[PDB]
Design a protein around this ligand. Structure first.
Ligand SMILES: *[C@@H]1O[C@H](CO)[C@@H](O)[C@H](O)[C@H]1NC(C)=O
Ligand SMILES: [Cl-]
Lengths: 131, 124
């Protein structure tokens, strides 16, 4: 079983959270609101369909993404180590929102596919923990 | 530098207006001269120069620079530390555009298939 209104799937409990938070705040919320909780990890197509159905209610809202627990943890604002000419990428000048190192489910695919987006942006999310 | 090219710290630059997707722009740069490719931008000073140069050549001052796929070689990890294998991240190749505004300069990404003006650079 799962507590309160959490939904069960393959031995884990999940909960969709409507109040938007940035990726870091969402992860923290999941760690605080559930024993050993974290933003959802999606390890198979089946789990993805389950999560997409779990957040089907967000299809009516304006938010185009839903946070999942995937991100590139580096300090840098992007991953590619070099420019086209081989020189190192050090200096960068991205517009606000253009460094996208965290991932979320996409509204266009009814929340099945994932896209890398701005970690500081605010979106609803999904928590998961082991029962 | 040759006719049409501008000099800055031992390099030669030139902005091309006719729009092209990133790969054809890169090819066109390589054709113009030895060691020429879409410009890498290594500092705010180099950036400022290239920007003023673009403003003279482009009515719509947006241009491809030499950064294709900023998300090449990322290391995606799950916050619960589960192993990363299955993935539904399917972003196609995106490329970098430098935009010049009256009050600032910034970069953003666009599908590499889009058509944008561009700027070339080579070591004199
Ligand atoms: C860029 O244009 C060339 C020739 O038109 C084409 O072969 C190439 O695939 C295009 N690149 C993209 C990303 O569409
Ligand atoms: Cl993490």
């Amino acid at each position: 079983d799962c507590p309160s209104d959490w939904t069960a799937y393959d031995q884990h409990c999940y909960l969709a959270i409507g109040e938007p938070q940035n990726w870091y705040e969402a992860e923290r919320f999941c760690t605080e609101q559930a024993k050993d909780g974290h933003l959802v990890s999606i390890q198979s197509r089946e789990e993805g369909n389950f999560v997409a159905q779990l957040v089907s209610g967000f299809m009516h809202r304006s938010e185009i993404y839903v946070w999942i627990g995937l991100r590139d943890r580096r300090e840098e604002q992007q991953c590619n180590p070099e420019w086209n000419d081989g020189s190192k990428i050090i200096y960068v000048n991205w517009k606000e929102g253009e460094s996208k190192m965290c991932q979320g489910l996409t509204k266009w695919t009814n929340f099945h596919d994932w896209n890398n987006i701005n970690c500081e942006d605010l979106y609803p999310f999904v928590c998961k923990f082991s029962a | 530098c040759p006719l049409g090219w501008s000099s800055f710290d031992q390099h030669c630059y030139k902005v091309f207006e006719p729009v092209k997707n990133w790969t054809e722009a890169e090819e066109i740069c390589m054709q113009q001269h030895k060691g020429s490719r879409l410009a890498s931008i290594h500092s705010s000073e180099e950036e400022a120069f290239v920007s003023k140069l673009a403003s003279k050549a482009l009515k719509f001052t947006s241009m491809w620079i030499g950064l294709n796929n900023p998300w090449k070689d990322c290391k995606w990890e799950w916050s619960d530390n589960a192993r990363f294998d299955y993935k539904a991240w399917k972003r196609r190749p995106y490329c970098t555009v430098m935009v010049v505004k009256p009050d600032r300069i910034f970069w953003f990404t666009r599908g590499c298939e889009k058509s944008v003006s561009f700027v070339c650079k080579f070591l004199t």
